[PDB]
Structure formats: C-alpha cells, structure tokens
Design a protein around this nucleic acid. Structure first.
Lengths: 367, 367
DNA sequence: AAGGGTCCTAGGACCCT
DNA sequence: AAGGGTCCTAGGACCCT
C-alpha cells in the first residue's frame, strides 16, 4: 500500500528554453511574454521583482532592463516538455504529466527492486540525496524512511539526467503520495530536491497559508470556502463534513477534506500521448466580421501539422470563441474521408462559427 | 472496402424467453407486461391484434383470452441476451449489440476465408440461404453477389446454432453495411432471413413510408424534418444539404442524409462487457417522502449483486428521478474503499437525492 | 487581446423491448 | 407508474505557464 512518489518541477521552464536557444539572455533578466503578460521569468528577473503573470507594464516598471521574448508559440516548450516526460518514462514507465513542466512518477516498484539488491551491510549506509523536509532526523531502521531515501536517490539521478541530456534544471519532491510530493518539491526551490518523511506531513500541510495552495482547491472552491469561514488548512480539517458535503458536493467535499490532511490515494496515471491538440488566438475585440475565417485558417494550418506528425487521427473538431463581456464552443465529428484537407475543415468550422476577443480550435477524440 | 454485415434480430424476445420457461404459454396468446404496458407479445397474440407497447387495457380489449406475464424484471432476458451475443462472438469476435435482442456481426473476414477455400468448380455452385430481397436475380460472376451469399450461409448457421443451442428463433439480414442489414433483416419477419444484393438497395430504402423508419432518425429529428416538409426518404435525399446543416447540425444532417441513400460506413463495434448497470422503479406519484430511501435500498440490493458477479468495479454512481409534470440526475465518484457496502452506498445516494414517479440508480465508469 | 492541458457532469439524441 | 442501453455535447472545475 505504501508508495514512493516523485514530483519533478522544472524551474522557469519557458525561460530555460529561451535561455538555451539564445545564451545571450542568461545573466540578463528574462521575461517570456504572451500579449500583455509576463508569464515566466528567469531567476535574475525574479530577484529584481518580476512575478509570474505580471503586466508587461508593471514588469518593466520594476525592471526596465528586463529583456522580453515572445512566448505565444508553445511549440518549442511543448517539444522539450515531451523530451522531459520521455526521459522520466525511461526510469519507470508510469509518468503523469501536469501541465508542461511538472511530472509525477511512481517509484515504488523501482525503490523495491533496489532494496532487494542490497545487503544488510550497506542498508545501514543508505543516505539521502538533497534536503530532508523540516530537517527531520532519519531512522535507518524505519523501512519507510529507507524507501523514501532511495526514492530521493532516484530523484537525483532523474534531475542529473535531465541536466546532462536536455540541459534543464528542476526541482524534485519525494513523498508517499502525489499531493505531498508536489507540495514538498517546492520547499527549496531553485534546482533542488526535498524528501518528506511521514512524521513531518502535518508540518507540511500546515505550512500553507491559504487553502487555494492545496492542489485541487481552485478559484471557485477556495471562494466558496472563504464564504463559509474556512480559511486555514486546519479550518478545513476540522469543519463539518456534513455541511461541506451539502455545500459543495459529496465529491468535492470528501476529496478536498482528505487533501486537507495530506491524504491522497489517487494513482499516478500514465499520461501517454495527448488527448487533444488546440491552439488559441486572442485579441482586443479585433474580430467583428466573418472574415475571421482567416484566423481560423491560421490555427488550422498549425494544428494540421501537429496532428499529422502525431500519427493518430482526431475524430472531433471544436471551435471556441470569447465575446466581449465564460467561453463558448461548438464541436462535431470529423467526416471519415477527411480523417484520411484544409478546405473541408474550414467550412465545417465556419458552420460551427455561424451557429454561434478569442478564437480557438481543438482537435480531440483521437484514435 | 467492401463489407458483409449480418444483423440478427430475435423474434419477440421477452415472449420467447417466457414461453421457454413455461411451455404452458406456447399456443395461447402471450403478452409480456411492464406496468400498464404490453411491451411484447408472442406471434399468436400478434395475429389477434396485440401490438408492441399497447395498453394492457387495449390489449385485453382486442384479446380478452390474452395471457399476461410480468416482465418488469429483465434479469432472465438480459442473461439470455448475453448468451446470444456470446454464441455469435464464437462465429466472428466483432459483435455489436443493439438493445437486448439485436446483434451486428462483421462477416467480411470470415466470408473471405471461406471463398479462399473453394475451388473454381464449386464457386459456380454457391447458393443463397433464405430470401433474396426483391426476388433479385443472382449473378454468380459478380464477386459481390458471391460474397453476400456466403454471408447468407453463415447467417443461417448462426440462426441454426441459436436455435439448437439456446432454443431461440430469430431473423437475419445480410447486406454491405449495418443500416442495410438491419433494414433487410425484417423483410420476412417470423424467423427467416433475407440477403440484399447491391442492385436493390434503393428499392429497399424507398420501401420505407416514414423517415423515422431509418435507424438514426428519432423522435426529435423526424419531427424537425416534418416541420420542414421532408416526409419521404426521397424528400430527405433531395433536400438542401445547406439548409439541413443549418437546421440540425453539421453532424446530424450529414449523417441522416447519407442514411437516406442507404450509405453507412460506421464499423461494427465490439460491444463487449456493458458500460453501465442500472435499474428503474416507476410508480404513480407513489413517492412523496424521504422514506423513498427504501426504494433506493431495493435497487441497490439487486445492482450490487449484478456488479459483484460482473467482476469489474464501477467507479461512479448516479441517481435518477422523475417529477410529476425530462428526467433529472446527480452522480458522484464511488470512494476507493467502497469499490472494495450497502450502508455507505445509501447515504451517498440520499445526499444525491436531497440535492434534487420514478427512481433509478446507475453504476457506470467501470474499471 | 496568455496559452495551453485534464477529467467530470447533467442532459439530450439515438437504439431496442 | 416500461425498463433497459449507447455515445455525444457544452460547459465547468481543476492543473501549469
């Protein structure tokens, strides 16, 4: 039942990728830009004040020497993202992606094989790699401690391979489940790793200051909890199950309250190939006529090239729009003969259009 | 590209099952009853006027000697239904269920193996089993005709095995796709079979009198088509694609208009194990208090026994209700420890209840 | 005028009796 | 006061940047 899970969290991923392609930008503070947004920055810029998702106006304010590169095209980030996941899959095949720059790996079966290969002698010599959360003392006779320290050794091999083979730095967190791994991976945050022994789990969850810091408690759920006086992790731990169920659902309540104790039995999922491919175009109410077909041909151009190289074929297309004030969409299957090309796809899309600041196209239902 | 598909359609299935268990009822006219509904009748009752889905009041009217058995419990029908599908899967593994008493089998690869085993001599001796739709002449030099006649020979072996091994009679229809197979299987309808040669396909589709007779054109779609003056198969064939797309959707329009020509490239799907397990209880506004928990324990009792014997475990439960005037429902995942029992399931359900003439419970999301 | 992902949910269309 | 099935759809909650 007992698991060893690692969470791998790349430092400022878009920035890293841009700094590799143009070493010119290392040393100088770097911001990666999407419209008016500095969506990530290298660490020199984080020293000078730049925060994730800051206005490009605010960001030059706090740092007029800030270099900006455009990050509206995710192609390179996406490709390097899969290079990371694939490398980790070599260590153990069950890798779960979370966004482009985080991965989960269930190391249990791998930790176990390594322990079976040791003799009693060196067992007393198992050492941690990296930080131990909360400076907690190790008990080498605790088989749980021993297995997590091996997990920490694998975690370090992972981060080293990632640097040696892909030039990427990153953090890792080793714990007994996904929640705890992800919470502990960030404790020492520039390119380091931390392992969480069971005795310090409550210290970990209680180190959080707002409930939204729990992965799984989002913009809506946090807001609903604040509206019930629930504000700290302990508040959620002690709050009435019953009231919580009736207010948010048996599903949401029962799951975030388990999370509030640091419990999380959800398995590491094999993410494998993507389930969808999409692209977006945003713009200040810059589309007011049906000649927004050109934007839709643009997105199609790139998506068609992405799906081709994938191999699998999508069997659904979806068009998404945003109006000047939620999003709205319309999907439909992709005709059989189309699966086996630009021109049929656009009128399909424009029929979806007419049936209905941003245009997006999504290819899902892949076979 | 060219396919040989068979559609197997059991005669008055619930009635057959009841007549087997109580041979007393053969010979005498039989109605199977669900509340006020005669939902199926053996053929003697069909001679005396009883129609599918007739009021039990109307049905005794037209036939006061009509025997009625209760068919609100589908257990026996369901079990025999899977005995049929399994038998057919022995012939070729790709079997698609449609309801409890219809199956599709793609016989293409099987027809092909049989032809490769024949010599030119007996090839000129291939014969049809059963009816040829529209009394159409066979051309033994037409390789399509030859392959469909083999399909008709397999179809007859199927129906014979079904009778010899399960005691069930039934019809079969052999054609080049699922739509045509299903439309032709009923042409000679008490326990017979029909094969459709390509030359007679238009005669087949045009033999229909209302569009709703096309599988895939239902209560809503037929009504919308009538409201556009589309009433015959030919009307749908000739109607404007454009208008049809804008009125019903690119998906619905493009698919039912292909159907109107007898075109249907949808593959035979391997149905395999069920995707859900549900049970219903209806009643004349017979539930007005939370003591409708008893009905919910009842449904659970049986569903739990069904899911146990299945093997796979559901990971979702759904409660459905109907109010006195659409249905409404609420679902939620099934806790992990529950998957591995009555008592936790009911309060879950009753929380779903309170969050909201019929009660139903459904177990889906199976793993 | 981010730009991507994941899975779930309630309802609705269809199929058969 | 049928009593079962199938898959799709638009939207919404969450994750990351």
């Amino acid at each position: 039942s007992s698991r060893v899970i690692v969470h791998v969290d790349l430092d400022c991923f878009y920035a890293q990728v841009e700094m590799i392609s143009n070493p010119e930008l290392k040393d100088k503070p770097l911001g990666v830009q999407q419209k008016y947004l500095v969506v990530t920055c290298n660490y020199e810029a984080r020293k000078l004040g730049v925060k994730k998702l800051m206005n490009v106006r605010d960001a030059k304010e706090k740092c007029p020497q800030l270099v900006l590169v455009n990050g509206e095209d995710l192609t390179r980030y996406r490709e390097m993202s899969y290079k990371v996941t694939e490398l980790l899959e070599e260590f153990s095949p069950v890798v779960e992606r979370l966004g482009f720059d985080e991965n989960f790996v269930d190391l249990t079966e791998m930790v176990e094989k390594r322990l079976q290969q040791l003799q009693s002698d060196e067992l007393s010599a198992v050492t941690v790699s990296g930080h131990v959360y909360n400076n907690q003392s190790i008990n080498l006779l605790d088989v749980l401690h021993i297995r997590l320290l091996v997990g920490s050794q694998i975690a370090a091999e992972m981060r080293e391979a990632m640097y040696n083979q892909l030039g990427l730095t990153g953090c890792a967190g080793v714990a007994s489940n996904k929640l705890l791994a992800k919470l502990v991976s960030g404790v020492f945050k520039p390119n380091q790793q931390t392992v969480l022994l069971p005795e310090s789990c409550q210290h970990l969850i209680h180190s959080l200051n707002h409930i939204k810091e729990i992965p799984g408690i989002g913009y809506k759920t946090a807001k609903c909890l604040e509206a019930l006086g629930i504000n700290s992790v302990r508040d959620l731990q002690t709050f009435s199950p019953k009231i919580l169920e009736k207010e948010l659902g048996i599903s949401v309540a029962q799951r975030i309250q388990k999370l509030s104790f640091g419990e999380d039995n959800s398995p590491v999922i094999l993410s494998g190939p993507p389930q969808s491919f999409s692209e977006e175009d945003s713009f200040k109410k810059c589309s007011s006529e049906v000649e927004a077909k050109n934007k839709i041909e643009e997105l199609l151009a790139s998506l068609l090239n992405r799906v081709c190289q994938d191999g699998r074929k999508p069997h659904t297309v979806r068009l998404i729009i945003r109006r000047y004030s939620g999003r709205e969409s319309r999907q439909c299957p992709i005709p059989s003969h189309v699966i086996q090309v630009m021109t049929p796809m656009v009128d399909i899309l424009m029929k979806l259009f007419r049936n209905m600041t941003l245009l997006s196209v999504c290819f899902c239902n892949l076979k």
